[PDB]
DNA sequence: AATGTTCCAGCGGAATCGGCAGCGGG
């Protein structure tokens, strides 16, 4: 699931039917505590970020970042937050819209009797 | 033919022979017929499987495929058999070798080396056979009588006691009787009709035991009792009967040879053997041994046994069955006759002892 | 003389033996080894009626035996100048090396020094062939390297296993490079992992590197969880092949490090595609000996289960449920005291904990921990004698400090009380984790069965522990064991040559009960077990426990599933309920006749119930009682009302 | 058994077993009668 | 040549019956 997963990521029929599936994949990869799974998940989110930027998918991008942030806050995982903040991935930061040239600030602003039975034996 | 094949048969045969030779070369053959097996146990099993497989694979397509292999095969087998004479299974391979080697002529005396090899080995084994037992002896007889002997006519006196031994070991092991018959046929036609002549009086009297059934052997039903083919036939001549006939035609009857087939072949041999030679089953027409056969074993009637009835108790004499009972027990040629004859002979001897010294 | 001069000089059985003797003489004359190697690697191509030759490959293929004998007579030279030409003639060099290797392997009986010398000499020159397994090398060459190495370290042993005894750094670098590449695919990596039983026996620092590269293999080459690609596709076939390779390698070398990978991948799926092979492998692992490494295996899987490891509860349960349990059962030892005493002290402590119902996640983790610990205790007690837990043995000696006045009955009651507390627990106010706590109660009762089956086989502790309930405070037993909501379906009807083939392998380098819906209730089998036990332990009725079952069974207010489960138990234990049959009519016949039996009036339990109830005829006399008579008549009327069932066989059966 | 095809294949194996048994017993009957007492 | 008769050819009803499938058992 290294190159075939990437080819799944690059394109499909619609902009769905592989989104939620890979959401489950990264969720179960986060469930197991092996770091390479976390690296695979960060690669997946990087690919999703570039694909959303290059395919006008800001809605999916921001919804996914908010959902994953809430989920990882809910569950007892820290090292995933460690690597994410070491990289920095959050919602769009330019103008809350498609395209602009504003430096990233939204990510920065959002992420700094019976008992007798026993003894009568 | 559909698959486009020029000489694949030749290569497969050659590789089969090479594989067999390699297996025999490293097998450590040091069940055994005399209280001895200081050898690897799983080697004889392998050897036996290979030997039977060879006998049921090698003889077919015996053609020029096997011709370049005879000398090498026979030489390896004869070496490793000379070093291991108690094997019972080098002789089977020798039998197959010689049968294939005389199916193609290969014998009119290179080739002469193989011929001298078999002359020596055949005489050697024909002398060593005199010390062997049932399976080893049967294999040795099979090999010996499988020798060409159309060309090995040399000292047939050495091979006659083998042939007749085979005839004795028939009546209980049919394949060996078949081998004896085939060998006698080959010797009669191909050997010169002047050196065989003094030996017929020795050979044929061994055949007599095969003519001892008088149409009383009805042990099994001599007709169809019930078959699915019979059931189908009883309701008409149609497709189901055709199917039952088509499946039963290719029964592949590999049961070796029935005893009645052997008896028929014995009669055909006797007839085909002439009328001069033919008379040699019997004795020699009022010599000493005939007139010794006309005298009762004992002149005075003993074993007077009174059969118990309700009122009489008449006396018969058991001393009149003893001859026929003994020749029956020895050479019954029928298992169910033989067991009854042996039982009666046991009882007779025991009666003999009892009357020898009773009250 | 074998070269055409005009298609091809055909050999024979004698034409080849002559040449064999001839060149055996030629080698007998003098050294001639350098010349022999020289024209053995000669690249002059031949052709026949196509070309596909090198006249050295043909030359070697013809003889290959006297050539190898001469090449082994003076091994050190021939090997050196053979690997001298590794780069330009890799095919023929590899073929000759394999030929000498398996020639020596054939001759490992008379000698042992020669194969070792050959292996050490090849390793001494392992640098000479680095282009073979380097990057950009053809994949066929890499497989050639793998097969060559497999032969090299299969002939004698992994004598290059420790402290760089041989050219260990080169071997290990080659092996890790082969396993670590990304362009390469799953089956070559499978034949690579076939060579693990030789490298999973070395100390840490490099075993860490092997573990890390194995983890990188498991990731990025295996399904997300499992069975995400369907059977038939090359992905599925390759994944299955790699799994079989891993499992046979693991069953060959009882290496703890492979457990934390095999069980790790097994137990993130609800049930794996090829799980039965996992359990067969584990059974093979445990049931052969070397008690210390068995303890190591148990400890490894136990550490996986016990450690914090924030993850799914289902995965943690699966750890013990599949891997550890099948390890414990099959064969560990009758004296495997190490894990035994290691777990006694800490299992009970976890059992003596308090359910922190604040977060569902931590509560689920606690339930799973207790369930696993106490299934472990179940298997402990089941496969273990009685004295070594009650007598003057290491029971008091380990649960308390040293020998104690009490004999062995401290841990017994210490766990039994909490057993009974767990499975006789009120559930009225709890509605958050139903199935999980149900499994906890079930396993509670299972190991209760196993323990009390070994408490000095006393006549009556079974009634007071297994069967005694306190309904006045909603302290029940079977209302906890049974789900009481899953409607059951109940369908209507359903020597020398062994050595030779081993040499060929080296050269090629290739070679009770019905589980329907209800007997699978994780308490059914042990229940029948202790019932058949305590019947065969020592006629109004047996003291109080069949009275308990009778009251729970012969009562149409006890909810349906308890009655069904008890009826199935009676069916499976009719052998022991037979001499008390006269009481088991109103319950059994009442259940069969009752039209509230489930579904359409299920026609499977009725079949077995009637077969059992009619088994003891001449006994139990279904007449003489008006309720019994009316129940029988109801049964008969209903039974003939439903006979047809268009299938002919079942109609005849009815 | 609700699957007619699976039952049929199981009896394919079974019936070829009785066919082989019948052929081998028919072959054996010859010498079995020949040497029977 | 107009027509009626004879003759030949073709279709269908009805009874029979055999085997062709498909369907259970071994």
UniProtKB/Swiss-Prot annotation, chain A:
It comes from the Eukaryota. Induction: In osteoblasts, by FGF2. The modification N6-acetyllysine is found at residues 66, 71. ADP-ribosylated by PARP3. Phosphorylated on serine residues. Phosphorylation by PRKDC may enhance helicase activity. Individuals with systemic lupus erythematosus (SLE) and related disorders produce extremely large amounts of autoantibodies to XRCC6 and XRCC5. Heterodimer composed of XRCC5/Ku80 and XRCC6/Ku70; heterodimerization stabilizes XRCC5 protein. Component of the core long-range non-homologous end joining (NHEJ) complex (also named DNA-PK complex) composed of PRKDC, LIG4, XRCC4, XRCC6/Ku70, XRCC5/Ku86 and NHEJ1/XLF. Additional component of the NHEJ complex includes PAXX. Following autophosphorylation, PRKDC dissociates from DNA, leading to formation of the short-range NHEJ complex, composed of LIG4, XRCC4, XRCC6/Ku70, XRCC5/Ku86 and NHEJ1/XLF. (Microbial infection) Interacts with human T-cell leukemia virus 1/HTLV-1 protein HBZ. This is X-ray repair cross-complementing protein 5. It comes from Homo sapiens. The chain holds residues 595 to 732 of 732 of the full protein.
UniProtKB/Swiss-Prot annotation, chain B:
The modification N6-acetyllysine is found at residue 239. It comes from the Eukaryota. Disulfide bonds: none annotated. It is found in: Nucleus; Nucleus, Nucleolus; Cytoplasm, Cytosol. Autophosphorylated at two clusters, the T2609 cluster and the S2056 cluster. Autophosphorylation induces a conformational change that leads to remodeling of the DNA-PK complex, requisite for efficient end processing and DNA repair. The modification Phosphoserine is found at residues 252, 304. It is linked to Immunodeficiency 26 with or without neurologic abnormalities: A form of severe combined immunodeficiency characterized by reduced or absent T and B cells, recurrent candidiasis, and lower respiratory tract infections. Some patients show dysmorphic features, severe growth failure, microcephaly, seizures, and impaired neurological functions. Belongs to the PI3/PI4-kinase family. Serine/threonine-protein kinase that acts as a molecular sensor for DNA damage. Involved in DNA non-homologous end joining (NHEJ) required for double-strand break (DSB) repair and V(D)J recombination. Must be bound to DNA to express its catalytic properties. Promotes processing of hairpin DNA structures in V(D)J recombination by activation of the hairpin endonuclease artemis (DCLRE1C). Recruited by XRCC5 and XRCC6 to DNA ends and is required to (1) protect and align broken ends of DNA, thereby preventing their degradation, (2) and sequester the DSB for repair by NHEJ. DNA-PK is a heterotrimer of PRKDC and the Ku dimer (composed of XRCC6/Ku70 and XRCC5/Ku86). Formation of this complex may be promoted by interaction with ILF3. Component of the core long-range non-homologous end joining (NHEJ) complex (also named DNA-PK complex) composed of PRKDC, LIG4, XRCC4, XRCC6/Ku70, XRCC5/Ku86 and NHEJ1/XLF. Additional component of the NHEJ complex includes PAXX. Following autophosphorylation, PRKDC dissociates from DNA. Interacts with DNA-PKcs-interacting protein (KIP) with the region upstream the kinase domain. This is DNA-dependent protein kinase catalytic subunit. It comes from Homo sapiens (Human). The gene is PRKDC.
């Amino acid at each position: 699931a290294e190159n075939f997963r990437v080819l799944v990521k690059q394109k499909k029929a619609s902009f769905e039917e592989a989104s939620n599936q890979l959401i489950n994949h990264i969720e179960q990869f986060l469930d197991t505590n092996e770091t390479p799974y976390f690296m695979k998940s960060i690669d997946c989110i990087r690919a999703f970020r570039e694909e959303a930027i290059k395919f006008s998918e800001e809605q999916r991008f921001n919804n996914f970042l908010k959902a994953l942030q809430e989920k990882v806050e809910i569950k007892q995982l820290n090292h995933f937050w460690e690597i994410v903040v070491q990289d920095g991935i959050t919602l769009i930061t330019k103008e809350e819209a498609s395209g602009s040239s504003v430096t990233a600030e939204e990510a920065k602003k959002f992420l700094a009797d019976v008992d007798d039975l026993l003894d009568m034996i | 033919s559909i698959l486009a094949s020029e000489s694949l048969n030749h290569l497969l045969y050659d590789e089969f022979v090479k594989s067999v030779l390699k297996i025999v070369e490293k097998l450590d053959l040091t069940d055994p017929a005399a209280n001895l097996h200081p050898a690897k146990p799983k080697d004889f099993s392998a050897f036996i499987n290979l030997v039977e497989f060879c006998r049921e694979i090698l003889p077919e397509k015996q053609a020029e495929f096997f011709e370049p292999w005879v000398y090498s095969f026979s030489y390896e087998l004869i070496l490793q058999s000379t070093r291991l004479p108690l094997i019972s299974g080098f002789y089977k391979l020798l039998s197959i070798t010689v049968r294939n080697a005389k199916k193609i002529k290969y014998f009119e005396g290179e080739k002469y080396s193989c011929f001298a090899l078999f002359v020596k080995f055949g005489k050697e084994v024909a002398v060593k056979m005199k010390q062997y037992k049932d399976e080893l002896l049967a294999s040795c007889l099979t090999f010996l009588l499988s020798l060409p002997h159309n060309i090995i006519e040399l000292d047939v006196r050495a091979y006659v006691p083998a042939l007749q031994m085979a005839f004795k070991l028939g009546l209980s092991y049919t394949p060996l009787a078949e081998v004896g018959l085939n060998a006698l046929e080959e010797w009669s036609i191909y050997i010169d009709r002047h050196v065989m002549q003094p030996y017929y009086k020795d050979i044929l009297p061994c055949l007599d035991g095969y003519l001892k059934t008088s149409a009383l052997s009805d042990e099994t039903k001599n007709n169809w009792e019930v078959s699915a083919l019979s059931r189908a036939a009883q309701k008409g001549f149609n497709k189901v009967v055709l199917k039952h006939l088509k499946k039963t035609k290719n029964l592949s009857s590999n049961e070796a040879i029935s005893l009645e087939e052997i008896r028929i072949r014995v009669v055909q041999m006797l007839g085909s053997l002439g009328g001069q030679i033919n008379k040699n089953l019997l004795t020699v027409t009022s010599s000493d041994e005939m007139m010794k056969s006309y005298v009762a074993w004992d002149r005075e009637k003993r074993l007077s046994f009174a059969v118990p009835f309700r009122e009489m108790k008449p006396v018969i004499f058991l001393d009149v069955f003893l001859p026929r009972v003994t020749e029956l027990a020895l050479t019954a040629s029928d298992r169910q006759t033989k067991v009854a004859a042996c039982e009666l002979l046991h009882s007779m001897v025991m009666f003999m002892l009892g009357k020898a010294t009773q009250m | 003389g074998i070269a055409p001069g005009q298609c091809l000089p055909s050999l024979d059985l004698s034409c080849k033996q002559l040449a064999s003797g001839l060149l055996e003489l030629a080698f007998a004359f003098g050294g001639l080894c350098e010349r022999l190697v020289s024209l053995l690697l000669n690249p002059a191509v031949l052709s026949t009626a196509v070309i596909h030759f090198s006249h050295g490959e043909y030359f070697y293929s013809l003889f290959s035996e006297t050539i190898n004998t001469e090449l082994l007579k003076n091994l050190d030279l021939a090997v050196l100048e053979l690997m001298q030409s590794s780069v330009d003639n890799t095919k023929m060099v590899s073929a000759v090396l394999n030929g000498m290797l398996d020639q020596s392997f054939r001759e490992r009986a008379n000698q042992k020094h020669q194969g070792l010398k050959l292996a050490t000499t090849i390793l001494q020159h392992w640098k000479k062939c680095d282009s073979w397994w380097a990057k950009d090398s053809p994949l066929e060459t890499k497989m050639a390297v793998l097969a060559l190495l497999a032969k090299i370290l299969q002939i004698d042993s992994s004598v290059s296993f420790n402290t760089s005894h041989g050219s260990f750094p080169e071997v290990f670098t080659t092996y890790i490079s082969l396993l670590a590449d990304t362009k390469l695919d799953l089956h070559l990596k499978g034949q690579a992992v076939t060579l693990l039983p030789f490298f999973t026996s070395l100390t840490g620092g490099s075993l860490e590197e092997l573990r890390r590269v194995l983890e990188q293999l498991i990731v990025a080459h295996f399904p997300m969880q499992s069975r995400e690609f369907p059977p038939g596709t090359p992905r599925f076939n390759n994944y299955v092949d790699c799994m079989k390779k891993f499992l046979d390698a693991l069953e060959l070398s009882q290496s703890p490090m492979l457990l934390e990978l095999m069980t790790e991948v097994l137990c993130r799926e609800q049930q794996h595609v090829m799980e039965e092979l996992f359990q067969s492998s584990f059974r093979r692992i445990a049931r052969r000996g070397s008690c210390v490494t068995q303890v190591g295996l148990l400890e490894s899987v136990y550490e996986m289960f016990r450690k914090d490891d924030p993850r799914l509860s289902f995965t943690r349960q699966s750890f013990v449920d599949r891997s550890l349990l099948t390890l414990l059962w099959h064969c560990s030892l009758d004296a495997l005291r190490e894990f035994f005493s290691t777990i006694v002290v800490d299992a009970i402590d976890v059992l003596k904990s308090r359910f922190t119902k604040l977060n569902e996640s931590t509560f689920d983790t606690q339930i799973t921990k207790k369930m696993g610990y106490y299934k472990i205790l179940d298997v402990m007690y089941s496969r273990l004698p009685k004295d070594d837990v009650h007598a003057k043995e290491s029971k008091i000696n380990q649960v308390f400090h040293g020998s104690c006045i009490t004999e062995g009955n401290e841990l017994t009651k210490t766990l039994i009380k909490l057993c009974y507390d767990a499975f006789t627990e009120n559930m009225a106010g709890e509605n958050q984790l139903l199935e999980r706590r149900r499994l906890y109660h079930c396993a509670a009762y299972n190991c209760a069965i196993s323990v009390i089956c070994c408490v000095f086989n006393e006549l009556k502790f079974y009634q007071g522990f297994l069967f005694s309930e306190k309904p006045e405070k909603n302290l029940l037993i079977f209302e906890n064991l049974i789900d009481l909501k899953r409607r059951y379906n109940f369908p209507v009807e359903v020597s020398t040559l062994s050595e030779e083939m081993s040499q060929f392998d080296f050269s090629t380098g290739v070679q009770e009960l019905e589980m329907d819906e209800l007997n699978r209730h994780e308490c059914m089998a042990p229940l029948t077990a202790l019932v058949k036990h305590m019947h065969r332990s020592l006629p109004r009725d047996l003291p109080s426990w069949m009275k308990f079952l009778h009251g729970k069974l012969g009562n149409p207010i006890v909810p349906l599933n308890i009655r069904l489960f008890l009826a199935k138990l009676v069916i499976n234990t009719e052998e022991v309920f037979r001499p008390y049959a006269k009481h088991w009519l109103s319950p059994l016949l009442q259940l069969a006749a009752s039209e509230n039996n489930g579904g359409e009036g299920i026609h499977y339990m009725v079949v077995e119930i009637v077969a059992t109830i009619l088994s003891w005829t001449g006994l139990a006399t279904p007449t003489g009682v008006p309720k019994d008579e009316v129940l029988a008549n109801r049964l008969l009327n209903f039974l003939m009302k439903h006979v047809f069932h268009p299938k002919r066989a079942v109609f005849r059966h009815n | 058994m609700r699957d007619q095809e699976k039952l049929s294949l199981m009896y394919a194996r079974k019936g070829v077993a009785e066919q082989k048994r019948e052929k081998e017993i028919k072959s054996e009957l010859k010498m079995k009668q020949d040497a029977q007492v």
